[PDB]
From a paper:
The ribonuclease (RNase) H family of enzymes catalyze the specific cleavage of RNA strands of RNA/DNA hybrid duplexes and play an important role in DNA replication and repair. RNase H cleaves the phosphodiester bonds of RNA in double-stranded DNA/RNA hybrids, leaving 3′-hydroxyl and 5′-phosphate groups at each cleaved site. This catalysis requires divalent cations such as Mg2+, Mn2+ and Zn2+. Structural analyses found that the DEDD motif coordinates the divalent cation at the active site, acting as metal ligands, and constitutes the pivotal scaffold for the catalytic reaction. In addition to the highly conserved DEDD motif, a histidine adjacent to the active site (His124 in E. coli RNase HI) in the loop structure between β5 and α5 has also frequently been discussed.
In the RNase HI–Mg2+ complex structure. we for the first time observed two Mg2+ ions in the catalytic site in a substrate-unbound state. Hereafter, we describe chain A of RNH_Mg_3 in detail as a representative, because it is best ordered in the crystal. In the RNH_Mg_3 data set, two Mg2+ ions, designated metals A and B, were observed in the vicinity of the active site, and both metals adopted a nearly ideal octahedral coordination with the surrounding acidic amino-acid residues and water molecules. Metal B was coordinated by four water molecules and the carbonyl groups of Asp10 and Glu48, while metal A was coordinated by three water molecules and the carbonyl groups of Asp10, Asp134 and Gly11. Two of the water molecules coordinating to the Mg2+ ions were shared. The distances between metal B and its coordination ligands were in the range 2.0–2.2 Å, whereas those of metal A ranged from 2.4 to 3.5 Å. A tightly bound metal B could be vital for precise binding to the phosphoryl group of a substrate. Conversely, loose interactions of metal A, which are reported to be pivotal to the nucleophilic attack of the coordinated water molecule, seem to correspond to mobility, which possibly benefits product release and the recruitment of a new Mg2+ ion. H2Oδ− made relatively strong interactions with Mg2+ at the B position and Asp70, with O–X distances of 2.20 and 2.61 Å, respectively, while the O–N distance of 3.45 Å between the imidazole group of His124 and H2Oδ− suggests a weaker hydrogen bond. These detailed views are in good agreement with a scenario involving a His124→H2O→Mg2+→H2O→PO4 carboxylate–hydroxyl relay mechanism, as proposed by the previous NMR analyses.
Residue numbers in the entry: 1 to 155
Write the structure that this text describes.
Amino acid sequence: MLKQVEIFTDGSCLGNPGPGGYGAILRYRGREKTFSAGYTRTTNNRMELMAAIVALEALKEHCEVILSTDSQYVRQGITQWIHNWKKRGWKTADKKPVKNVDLWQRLDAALGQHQIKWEWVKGHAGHPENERCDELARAAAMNPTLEDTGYQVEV
Ligand SMILES: [Mg+2]
Ligand SMILES: [Mg+2]
């Protein structure tokens, strides 16, 4: 049997683009570990991906992971887009590079490490760990210390 683990994720961004941060909680046997960092210019959706990437990459063995997020962007990519990407070489139908391909490829690499069950929640109301992830992400966005070196500025 695989170790069973729970991960909760959220991103936060003060603009589009603007300062942003991610927040994640990894829970195993009651014990909780938190992850967060802040970036000077980024987007909310890139921070949503970073939260999942960082928490999954922390795992040192193959796990069964219950992954909970309210991000409709992450949900659309996981359930609607990534199957096209893997057939098309990570390009659009116009043979153009897909947006945020650097983070989507990193997330896909981390996801392939584990047995993943996704828990798509509707919001933060009633989900205390997801609310705490939002607090972690917002706190980092208010004290950014890194550059989002993979963000291709759109403006
Ligand atoms: Mg969010
Ligand atoms: Mg948020």
